[PDB]
Design a protein around this nucleic acid. Structure first.
Ligand SMILES: [Mg+2]
Ligand SMILES: [Zn+2]
Ligand SMILES: [Zn+2]
Ligand SMILES: [Zn+2]
Lengths: 551, 177, 97, 171, 112, 84, 107, 270
DNA sequence: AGTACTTACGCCTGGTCAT
DNA sequence: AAGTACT
RNA sequence: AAGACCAGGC
């Protein structure tokens, strides 16, 4: 896949290490300074400004360039960009934790709030489960709001031992929108916890403190739950849409960045200009906002960040949410090729394991056969035959990884085949296919049938193999998928073939029988009362194809 | 590439790659404690020229042999005698090997796998480290200064006097031409 | 046509390993990306010509792999990253079991 | 300085060659993609020793095409210079900027100003050389160099070395 | 004893319809729901919290939320999950893939 | 970790998934111009040749059987009985 | 083993885990009027020697965690007084094969 | 859900049922290691029937003019009547079918005797019948030893798990137990000779088949049993098109959710 | 005891309107 | 709407 | 070409 050979060894993914991005790495990796918010028009002149999308990231206009990386569009994944924020911001999805952590550690000196000294604590440090330590720890010290300096050791409650210092009272905390607030207790003291602060307190937390709390010194240090540098997904994640030329077509995402950007610069230009001290934190919320909505948009703090036209805004998160999206609707299930669908009808003249494919499709669907002395002959004929007659083919591909389109190519009728080449040919009588009918909730909702190219337009399946698929002919449709590797078919014929499914394990009994006519009729035909004379008995005999020819 | 007998668990932060010097700190792939395929430990493999000349030859030869077990179904004098062995069992595009055989065979200091044997039986009583027990074998040396200076890794691991006897017995074994 | 969840679950039932992969890759997504044997990421700047490879930042040129995975997957990942989450791709197991 | 390191390599064999003498092919291909290779981590792969007992192990079959993949464990003679290593070789080229000495499969170069002082450079010479009070260095002359620094590149390794120390110079 | 009950009950839900299901299946399920410790619900609130890697639970009811707290606590995924592989485009350890196939060069000679 | 050919414990018979895959895999290669270790009684379809190679048990393959803990057992098409 | 009637004082109970090795357990009368183990459903369990256990593992190549678990408060677990780590063997009847051997470790 | 909750589950080569972690779920798929596919409803004759009938059918006493095998069945009949060393095997056999009985009546209290079990013995014999045109007239040719010593030697080769130790070779006997009862039930001297006049030929064949036919009914390390079981339930849960209690689909929902407040709570006390 | 949180069948074919 | 679990 | 709705098919 992709094409073009690479001297790079090739492996399978075996482990997936989930980490968090360190603003330091984010930079390293990036190839884009991303300072400007505009898209292109270097003063209307078409191209792209070394500002947003392409200060070296991926590209468009069908033009090699991608940091010389050439290859162009197809085969050049996105190249991340970064964009130095102005002031630290929260990570919409982490907020929940960033909070719980502070309630777990007190500021000023930044360190745990319960050491080996407290016993209930011990039992909470043996637990080998991030989800469980961090959930037990939290519950155990979310209540304590005083940075103890001296506690009664394993001996006398009389004798007091010393550890860390700074009893600066611990403030309870609550979540207001995208900011954290806490009081310090006669009468309270309410102040806003500046990101700039939290960040700090985390930076200082101890190495064995990280870990003690559900974390990991190398892949995910708390101090990273707070964004400082922002990775910039490259075109392919937020591609455009061109209506030829002199028009637009930008992608939703490529706007929120546009916003985040604007909202970033406006800020900065205040900390270096007429900075009315606390008329800034009115624009630092805006950043915190965008850089939050960019990732999530279905919050409880209402404002949807409706984009002109009142259209919602597809937050990154929204792209993966269950069903119709990436994970479930793009990865666990996809649209596929070498597949077809039409109406189904009975046809008591097909073997159970067969399936009537209409000529229309047999000529459309193709199978890649590899030229071999065993076939060459046959194959060259299919190729000679063209892509219009039935038994034929429609594509020859040589080692040189080049497609010969059999319907054009001044060489159509020509062509000598070469052992090694492939000849995408038409599906033929007896090509094992995977047939099926949705909803699929059985091994049997998908079985393998022998193909039988037939006229007229409908998949014609044998009757008995109905109840498994659970289908009627009142206008029902079914899907057919076509194998591709000599080994793929093998997997269908050797484990999916209808004959094998006859006995169902779901209820340790056969799962296909005899219905309607055949059944009804098989009874009449039985009766003592029922007698058959020669003239017919002879024909009937002839019908059973394996009749030993013994009247 | 060509993997090397040991899977150093690289935990993201690949940074520390020290210096390569005659402080005997050679790249990780050359600690004196490396691993053999059988799964054992094994002192590094220090080859002094003219000792390598014999090992390359040894195989390049035993190659020619088993390269025919299947075909059934004096200075300037060695320059020719080797070019052939190559044009027989080499890649013919191993311009490196060629150039390694000249170098290896011109600057060599021993012709007898016997003489080369004693060289080794001698130096291997030092307890010195391999790299040293190599530079010592392929480098002329009259004084200890000409030695412990062109091999600073020695300086304190041996008395001048001693390392000096060894050098005496070197120019004594140093095969003629 | 569509080969969704349900139709998958049956292929798993049948135990038709390869045919599954095929429907999922070779007949749909399929994509060849590069990685760093160090930081399990797509970073790598492969110039498949002059073979140059790099991956500054973790800075490489030597340890680099090539892997086949559904383009959607790649995307899933890149998308993830943009949200500041790092999906590491390693070609060897070190955790045993 | 020359080493005999234990390596291994992975060759992907197409089914075509799944013959009777496969072991033969592999080995053969091992040798094509190794003898003469170069890495900063292995240096110069010069020759494969003990051609015979080369361990092939069982190779597994990939899973889309039939290509199989074997982890060929071999053992070879390598050599990778270092900063501070002392070696001697044969000069090859010699210019106004210095001469280049060839230590083995590698080429170490020496900067005019990295040699001594009393040694000037005579251009009007044929062949080109470097004259001294009593010393004369040109094409074939044999020098002994001290490698000050290494630089790995593509399929080779060069390095700069001095002769401004003691016990260094011609021989 | 609870298992016994959980099973007996489920068994009745399929028997009240005149349908028959071979023990083993309800057994299995009933067992899956019970090993862990007590009663693990076949719901987002249960079996999708177990020690199973991320990517797997990711393909169900909590996706992102689950992914987030994965890179947070730097989880590691075995890629032993059916799901896992499907997402990667790899052949999954399942029937046809519960083993490897190799060419025994030795036996590849006595064959000629 | 590996496991001695003795101390072996798996099933002496070939699993359907195994056989299934062998034939496939085998075909695959056969269709790729891999050598064919059996006299073709006129056969010309790879999977069909495969079924033959597999009946004279002349298939040069080895099924490595991984165990839940990582260790494996190595069985040869040769050995493995084929009931089905 | 101590048998309280209507209940024990929460001031009291927090004095059992204060003299190790020795162990203590608490049972309400009302829960011992009937032996739970005699119930049609609850099959019989069995304690395994720290030897018999170190075996069960080695024979199934299992790690402690991969084993089916039982609650430290689970009725039967108290009836035998298990300890976090002790493994029990559950032997029950079966409509597929008379007897089925299963194991449960403790957590 | 059902499905997503059991994907990862399959039968591993050790013949245990685990998921993606390795956590055993069933130490033997279905407490018996048999692939559902090869199973039919057989009857355990040993269970039902008056203590009376049992004797008249399975009891053999070579020390009694009226409880011995009439030499009209066994070739070595007359020269057996009385043989004491035999009556011990004979008695051993009986003291077993007896144990079997009580055992079964301890598992299937109902008295239901028809159960799903691998290898359909009824038919396997039926073929043996007309495959050797066995005549109900002339006598057999089985040493009593021939029978009872082979039936035993049969059970031995019905291997499900293979282990080279105790803990395993012990689960073996277990996973088989139920079957055997049925086996010992259908290959009881009396029966084997008075009901289905099998020759030594017939028999040695019936035995071979059973062994092989069994080794076929085992489960294949590979089956993704998890998904399967899932579907197998969810499937008939759609065909559900609908004495006064919560029953059916809304119920099954309740169950899988592990809900606390079930519309109907009931409770039967005897 | 009150509030908040995530979910909701599978697939497939039409025609319509607009920032 | 409902049902659960978390605050 | 993408997204929202509506009607509809099994
Ligand atoms: Mg219908
Ligand atoms: Zn690029
Ligand atoms: Zn503090
Ligand atoms: Zn990198």
């Amino acid at each position: 896949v992709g094409q073009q050979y690479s001297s790079a060894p090739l492996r399978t993914v075996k482990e997936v290490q989930f980490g968090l991005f360190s603003p330091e790495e984010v930079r390293a990796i990036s190839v884009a300074k991303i300072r400007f918010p505009e898209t292109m028009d270097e003063t209307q002149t078409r191209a792209k400004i070394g500002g947003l999308n392409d200060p070296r990231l991926g590209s468009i206009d069908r033009n090699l360039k991608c940091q010389t990386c050439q290859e162009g569009m197809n085969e050049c994944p996105g190249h991340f960009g970064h964009i130095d924020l102005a002031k630290p911001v929260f990570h919409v999805g982490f907020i929940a934790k960033i909070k719980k952590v502070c309630e777990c550690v007190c500021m000023h000196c930044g360190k745990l709030l319960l050491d080996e000294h407290n016993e209930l604590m011990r039992q909470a440090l043996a637990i080998k489960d991030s989800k469980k330590r961090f959930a037990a720890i939290w519950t155990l010290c979310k209540t304590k709001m005083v940075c103890e300096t001296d506690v009664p050791s394993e001996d006398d409650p009389t004798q007091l031992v010393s550890r860390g210092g700074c009893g600066n009272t611990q403030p309870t905390i609550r979540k207001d929108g995208l900011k954290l607030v806490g009081s310090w207790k006669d009468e309270p003291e309410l102040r806003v916890l500046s990101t700039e602060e939290i960040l700090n307190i985390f930076k200082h937390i101890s190495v064995k403190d990280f870990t003690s709390l559900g974390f990991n010194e190398v892949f995910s240090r708390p101090e990273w739950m707070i964004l400082t540098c922002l990775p910039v997904p490259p075109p392919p994640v937020r591609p455009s849409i061109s209506f030829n030329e002199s028009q637009r077509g930008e992608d939703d995402l490529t706007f929120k960045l546009a916003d985040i950007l604007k909202a970033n610069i406006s800020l900065e230009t205040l900390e270096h200009n007429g900075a009315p001290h606390h008329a800034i934190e009115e624009a630092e919320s805006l950043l915190q906002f965008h850089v939050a909505t960019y990732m999530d948009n279905d919050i409880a703090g209402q404002p949807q960040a409706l984009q002109k036209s009142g259209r919602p805004v597809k937050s990154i998160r929204a792209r993966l949410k269950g069903k119709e999206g990436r994970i479930r609707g793009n990865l666990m299930g996809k649209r596929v090729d070498f597949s077809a669908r039409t109406v189904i009808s009975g046809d008591p003249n097909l073997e159970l394991d067969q399936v009537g494919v209409p000529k229309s499709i047999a000529k459309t669907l193709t199978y890649p056969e590899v030229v071999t002395p065993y076939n060459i002959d046959r194959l060259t004929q299919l190729v000679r035959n063209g892509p219009n007659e039935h038994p034929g083919a429609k594509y020859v591909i040589r080692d040189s990884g080049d497609r010969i389109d059999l319907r054009y190519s001044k060489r159509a009728g020509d062509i000598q085949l070469q052992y090694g080449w492939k000849v995408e040919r038409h599906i033929m009588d007896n090509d094992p296919v995977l047939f099926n009918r949705q909803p699929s909730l059985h091994k049997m909702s998908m079985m393998a049938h022998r193909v039988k190219v037939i006229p007229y337009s409908t998949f014609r399946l044998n009757l008995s193999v109905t109840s498994p698929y659970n289908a009627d002919f009142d206008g029902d449709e079914m899907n057919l998928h076509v194998p591709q590797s000599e080994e793929t078919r093998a997997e269908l014929s050797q484990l999916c073939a209808v004959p094998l499914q006859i006995v169902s394990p779901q209820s340790n009994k056969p799962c296909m029988g005899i219905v309607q006519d055949t059944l009804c009729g098989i009874r009449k035909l039985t009766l003592r009362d029922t007698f058959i004379e020669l003239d017919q008995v002879l024909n009937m005999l002839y019908w059973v194809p394996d009749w030993d020819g013994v009247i | 590439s060509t993997s090397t007998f040991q899977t150093r668990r690289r935990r993201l932060k690949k940074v520390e790659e020290e210096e390569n010097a005659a402080t005997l700190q050679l790249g990780q792939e050359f600690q004196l404690k490396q691993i053999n395929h059988q799964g054992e430990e094994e002192e590094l493999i220090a080859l002094n020229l003219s000792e390598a000349r014999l090992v390359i030859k040894e195989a390049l030869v035993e190659r020619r042999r088993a390269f025919k077990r299947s075909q059934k179904k004096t200075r300037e004098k060695e320059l020719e005698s080797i070019d052939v062995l190559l044009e027989q069992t080499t890649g013919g595009n191993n311009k490196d090997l060629k150039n390694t055989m000249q170098y290896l065979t011109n600057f060599s200091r021993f012709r007898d796998q016997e003489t080369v044997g004693a060289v080794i039986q001698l130096l291997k009583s030092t307890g010195l480290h391999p790299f040293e027990v190599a530079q010592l074998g392929s480098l002329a040396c009259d004084t200890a200064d000409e030695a412990k200076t062109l091999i600073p890794s020695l300086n304190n691991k041996i008395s001048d006097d001693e390392l000096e006897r060894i050098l005496k017995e070197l120019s004594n074994l140093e095969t003629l031409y | 046509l569509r080969f969704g969840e349900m139709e998958r679950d049956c292929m798993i039932a049948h135990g038709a390993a390869s045919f599954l992969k095929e429907r999922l890759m070779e007949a749909s997504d399929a994509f060849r990306v590069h990685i760093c044997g160090i930081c399990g990421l797509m970073t790598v700047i492969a110039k498949l010509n002059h073979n140059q490879f790099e991956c500054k930042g973790c800075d490489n040129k030597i340890d680099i792999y090539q892997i086949h995975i559904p383009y959607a997957a790649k995307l899933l990942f890149q998308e993830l990253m943009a949200m500041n989450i790092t999906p590491r791709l390693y070609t060897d197991r070190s955790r045993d079991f | 300085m020359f080493f005999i390191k234990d390596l291994s390599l992975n060759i992907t064999l197409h089914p075509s060659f799944f013959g009777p003498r496969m072991k033969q092919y592999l080995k053969t291909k091992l040798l094509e993609e190794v003898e003469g290779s170069c890495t900063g981590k292995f240096g110069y792969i010069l020759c494969v020793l003990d051609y015979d007992n080369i361990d092939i192990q069982r190779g597994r079959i990939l899973p889309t095409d039939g290509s199989a993949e074997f982890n060929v464990k071999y053992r070879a003679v390598v050599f990778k210079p270092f900063k501070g290593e002392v070696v001697d070789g044969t000069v090859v080229s010699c210019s106004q900027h210095g001469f280049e000495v060839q230590v083995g499969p590698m080429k170490v170069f020496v900067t005019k100003h990295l040699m001594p002082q009393d040694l000037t450079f005579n251009a009007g010479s044929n062949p080109p050389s470097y004259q001294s009070s009593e010393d004369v260095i040109t094409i074939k002359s044999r020098i002994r160099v001290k490698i000050e620094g290494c630089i790995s590149q593509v399929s080779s390794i060069h390095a700069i070395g001095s002769i401004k120390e003691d016990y260094l110079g011609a021989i | 004893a609870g298992r016994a009950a959980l099973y007996k009950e489920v068994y009745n839900v399929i028997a009240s319809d005149g349908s028959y299901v071979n023990y083993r299946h309800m057994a299995l399920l009933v067992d899956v729901m019970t090993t862990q410790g007590g009663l693990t619900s076949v719901t987002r609130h249960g079996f999708n919290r177990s020690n199973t890697g991320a990517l797997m639970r990711c393909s169900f009811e909590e996706t992102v939320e689950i992914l987030f707290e994965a890179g947070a606590s730097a989880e590691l995924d075995d890629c032993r999950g059916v799901s896992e592989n499907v997402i990667l485009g790899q052949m999954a350890p399942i029937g046809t893939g519960a083993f490897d196939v190799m060419i025994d060069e030795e036996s590849l000679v006595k064959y000629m | 970790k590996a496991i001695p050919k003795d101390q072996r414990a798996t099933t002496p018979y070939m699993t359907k998934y195994e056989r299934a895959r062998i034939l496939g895999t085998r075909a695959l290669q056969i269709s790729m111009n891999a050598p064919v270790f059996v006299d073709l009684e006129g056969e010309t379809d790879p999977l069909r040749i495969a079924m033959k190679e597999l009946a004279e048990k002349k298939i040069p393959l080895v099924i490595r059987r991984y165990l839940p803990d990582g260790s494996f057992e190595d069985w040869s098409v040769e050995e493995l009985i084929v009931d089905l | 083993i101590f048998v309280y009637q209507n209940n024990i004082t929460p001031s009291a109970m927090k004095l059992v885990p204060s003299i190790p090795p020795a162990t203590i357990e608490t049972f309400n009368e009302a829960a011992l009027v009937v032996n739970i183990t005699h119930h049609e459903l609850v099959p019989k369990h069995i304690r395994l020697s720290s030897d018999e256990k170190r075996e069960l593992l080695k024979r199934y190549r299992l790690k402690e965690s991969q084993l089916p678990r039982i609650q430290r408060a689970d009725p039967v677990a108290l009836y035998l007084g298990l300890k976090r780590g002790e493994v029990v063997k559950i032997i029950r009847k079966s409509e597929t094969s008379g007897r089925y051997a299963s194991y449960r470790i403790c957590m | 859900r059902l499905v997503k909750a059991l994907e990862d589950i399959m039968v591993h080569y050790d013949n245990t049922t685990r998921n993606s972690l390795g956590n055993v779920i069933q130490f033997i798929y279905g407490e018996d290691g048999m692939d559902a596919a090869h199973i039919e409803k057989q009857s355990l004759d040993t269970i039902g029937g008056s203590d009376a009938a049992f004797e008249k059918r399975y009891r053999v006493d070579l020390l009694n003019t009226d409880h011995t095998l009439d030499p009209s069945l066994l070739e070595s009949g007359s020269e057996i009547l009385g043989d004491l060393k035999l009556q011990v095997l004979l008695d051993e056999e009986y003291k077993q079918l007896v144990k079997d009985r009580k055992f079964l009546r301890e598992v299937f209290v109902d008295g239901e005797a028809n159960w799903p079990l691998p290898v359909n013995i009824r038919r396997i014999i039926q073929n043996a019948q007309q495959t050797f045109h066995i005549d109900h007239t002339k006598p057999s040719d089985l040493t009593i030893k021939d029978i009872v010593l082979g039936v035993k030697d049969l059970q031995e080769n019905l291997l499900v798990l293979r282990g080279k130790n105790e803990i395993i070779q012990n689960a073996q006997r277990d996973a088989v137990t139920l079957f055997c009862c049925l086996l010992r039930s259908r290959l009881a001297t009396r029966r084997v000779l008075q009901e289905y006049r099998l020759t030594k030929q017939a028999f040695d064949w019936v035995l071979s088949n059973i062994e092989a036919q069994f080794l076929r009914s085992v489960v294949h390390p590979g089956e993704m049993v998890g998904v399967l079981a899932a579907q197998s339930i969810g499937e008939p849960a759609t065909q559900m098109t609908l004495k006064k209690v919560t029953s059916g689909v809304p119920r099954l929902k309740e169950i899988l959710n592990v809900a606390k407040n079930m519309k109907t709570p009931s409770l039967t006390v005897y």
